[PDB]
C-alpha cells in the first residue's frame, strides 16, 4: 500500500530547508510508494499540537516527521507538543537519535527530541539543519561507504509494520530496512 | 543468604523458551544460592501488574526478571505494567539494555524495556527470544572471549546489595559482578 | 559577564571532597570570570529542594552542580529533588553522563542522575567521588592526550548562552567549549 507521511517544519527560526530536505531524502530512500502532507508552522506549542493531531487523526498519516524547535531555549517546544499528543512513548528513539547525532553535532546532548506513537502512527522529532536531518535518518558511514552507526530510519519500516501499517521497503544503498525473518515477505 | 528470584514469561506470543532460558542462564551465572518463583501469563496489563506485586510483596523476591511484551505493538504492555507498580525508576537499565542489544538485535531501539525498584526489589524487563535474553544479561565478547560490552547483570549483584538484599556472587567465566572496594567481602 | 555557579554537596555519606573537587576543576577549566555559592547539606529531599530553589531563585545562579546522593539506595534522593524543582527536563544530560561514566565506573548504570532547567538556570547531578566528578565533566582521553569521549561540560557553555546567560569560555587544554559558527564571538 501507499505510505502516508506528514512533514512538519516548525519554522520558528525563508529557505525552509526543512520540508525540502525531508522530501529529498525520503524520495531517495524509499522504494515503495508514498504520499506527503506538508506543513510549515511557528514554534508555538498549541499550534504544533493541533498540527500533529490534524495529520494523524484527520489525514490518517502512518508516519509524521518534524524538523526544528528541539533545543533547550524556552521558545523550543516541539518535543513538549509531541509528548502532549502521544498515547505511548518510545524511549529508544530519543536516546539513539542523540547517540547518532553525537557524531555530527558536537552539542547533540542539548536536544530534547522524542519519538512517540499516537493511535497507530509514529511521530519522530528531527533537527532543523538539512545536513543533520539526513545524517540522523541515514546514519554514519566511512570513506569506503561502510555503515559505522545505523541511521534511525533503519528501524522505521519494521515499526510501521508492527503498528499494522503498510509494508515499507528502502533502497539499501541509502539505508537498509531491518526486519526479522518472521516479518520479511 | 539465598537470593529469591521471580521469573515471569509474558507468553502473549508452546515452547515458552522464556522461563527455561532464564533458569539455564542463572544456574550457570550464579555461584551463591538462589530459589526461583516462576510464572507464565498472558500479555494483559492488569495480570502482569498483579503478578509483579504478588512476587515482590507476597513472595518476598529480591529480584524479578520478565521476558516478552516489550515492543511497540499495542498488545505489548510489560513495560507499562512494570512502571505502574514501581516506587522508583532506574533510567540507566532501560538505556543500557538498548545499547547492549544494539549489537545483536538490529531493531533494538524499538524496545520499551525498563528497570525499576518496588519496595526493596529490582525488576528488569528482558526480550522474549532466548538468545537475546542471554546476550542482554551477559553482554558481548570477541572470538577470544574478551568482554567488549558488559552485560546488564554485571551491575545486578551490587544493586541488590545497596537495596539491603543478600550478598550475590557470580562465575567470572560467565559474567563478572562489579563491586567497589568499599563493598567487597 | 561573571558566571554565578552554585555548588551543592549532599554530604549524606569529613573530607567533603565534593565542594573542593568542583572548585578545583572549575578554576582550571574556566577562562572567563565566575563566582561561587557553596552549600553542604544532608541527603534529605526537602532540604535539597529548598537549597536548589534558594540558589536559582534568590542567588540568581546561572548554573548549579550537585555532588552525591544519586544511587539506587532509598536514602539517595538528589535526582528526585532535582526533578521536583525543574521547569523542563534535559534527557541527554542524564543519558550521556551515564555513557561517559561507563568508562570509569563499572556500575555507572545504577546512577539516576539528571540534568534539568529551572527558570533560566541549568542544574546537573554529578557523582560523589572526586575522580568521578572530574572525569564526567572533562571526559576521557588516551595516553597521548587525545579526546576519546567528550566530557559533559563541553556542551555547558553553549547551553548557558542559549538560556540567555553570560558568555562562557574554557581552557581547551582541559575541555573545549563547543559552539556553532552562529554563536561564536
Q: Rough shape of chain A?
A: globular
CATH level-1 class of chain A: Alpha Beta
The assigned structural class of chain A equals: alpha/beta
Secondary-structure element order of chain A, as H and E? EHEHEHEHEEHEEH
CATH fold title of chain A: Molybdenum Cofactor Biosythetic Enzyme, Chain A
Distance between the termini of chain A: 14 Å
What count of structural domains of chain A?
Answer: 1
Rg of chain A, Cα atoms, Å: 15 Å
This entry's quaternary arrangement is homotrimer
Please give a structural write-up.
The structure is a homotrimer of 185-residue chains. Chain A has 185 residues and is α/β, with parallel strands linked by helices. The first copy, chain A, has helices at 18-29, 45-58, 78-85, 91-101, 130-138, 156-162, and strands at 3-10, 34-41, 63-67, 88-89, 115-118, 121-126, 139-141, 147-150. Chain A has one domain (1-185): Molybdenum Cofactor Biosythetic Enzyme, Chain A, CATH 3.40.980.10. In chain A, the strands form 2 sheets. Chain A has a 6-stranded mixed β-sheet, sandwiched between helices. A two-stranded antiparallel ribbon of chain A has the order 7-8. The A-B interface holds A 88-93, 95-96, 99, 117, 120, 122, 150, 152, 154-155, 158-159, 162-163, 178-180 and B 71-74, 94-95, 98-99, 102, 106-112. It is classed as unknown function. The entry lists the keywords molybdenum cofactor, moco, moybdenum CO-factor, MOG, moga, gephyrin, unknown function. It forms a trimeric assembly.
